[PDB]
Amino acid sequence: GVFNYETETTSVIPAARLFKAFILDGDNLFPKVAPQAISSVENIEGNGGPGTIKKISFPEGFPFKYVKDRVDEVDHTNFKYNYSVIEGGPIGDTLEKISNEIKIVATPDGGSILKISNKYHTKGDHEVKAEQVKASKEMGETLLRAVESYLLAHSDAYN
Numbered sequence: 001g002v003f004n005y006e007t008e009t010t011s012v013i014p015a016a017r018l019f020k021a022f023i024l025d026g027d028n029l030f031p032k033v034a035p036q037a038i039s040s041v042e043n044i045e046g047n048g049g050p051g052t053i054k055k056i057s058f059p060e061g062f063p064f065k066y067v068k069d070r071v072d073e074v075d076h077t078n079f080k081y082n083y084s085v086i087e088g089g090p091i092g093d094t095l096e097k098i099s100n101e102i103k104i105v106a107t108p109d110g111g112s113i114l115k116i117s118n119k120y121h122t123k124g125d126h127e128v129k130a131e132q133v134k135a136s137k138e139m140g141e142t143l144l145r146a147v148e149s150y151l152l153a154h155s156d157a158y159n
């Protein structure tokens with residue numbers, strides 16, 4: 001079955017610039033701006049388009065060693081990014097896949113709004129724990145703020 005989780009957050013970065021950096025160049029930025037959140041990002045196969053497999057390794061002492069994500073869909077026009085956690089970390093005999101959908105909307109003040117949907121695909125009927133989702137939300141938030149700060153301090157990047 002599927003557990004559906006949802007949340008929203010704001011950014012001081014315009015939608016397109018944030019999408020280009022935070023979403024489309026997370027491979028480069030995450031290990032650079034938040035090394036104590038993500039140690040490395042490895043392209044296993046593909047470009048960045050649908051089907052691309054990436055291996056995200058976490059620092060020593062983290063609850064998980066790594067996860068492998070698969071790019072599902074990339075919409076440059078509507079700033080939509082869909083990806084799935086397909087292996088590692090929480091994935092195993094209790095959890096088959098986590099399908100994520102991200103959308104970034106412009107706001108008139110020059111910022112943006114992020115809408116993220118998480119779907120936990122469980123096999124035999126595990127329960128998904130509140131502290132698992134809450135941890136994942138904290139990770140995403142840490143990544144966003146660290147990228148945000150970088151983009152404020154590096155005006156020439158991702159224009």
Ligand SMILES: CCCCCCCCCCCCOS(=O)(=O)O
Pocket residue numbers: 034035036037058062063064065135136138139142
């Ligand atoms: C293994 C996947 C689950 C990880 C949960 C981590 C939540 C907190 C992430 C910030 C840690 C570091 O934050 S930082 O302020 O030093 O950059």
Ligand SMILES: CCCCCCCCCCCCOS(=O)(=O)O
Pocket residue numbers: 007008009022023026027054056069070071083102114116137138139140141143144
């Ligand atoms: C409200 C806190 C949540 C903010 C959203 C954070 C989502 C992380 C984006 C990773 C995109 C890159 O993922 S990738 O493995 O496919 O390259």
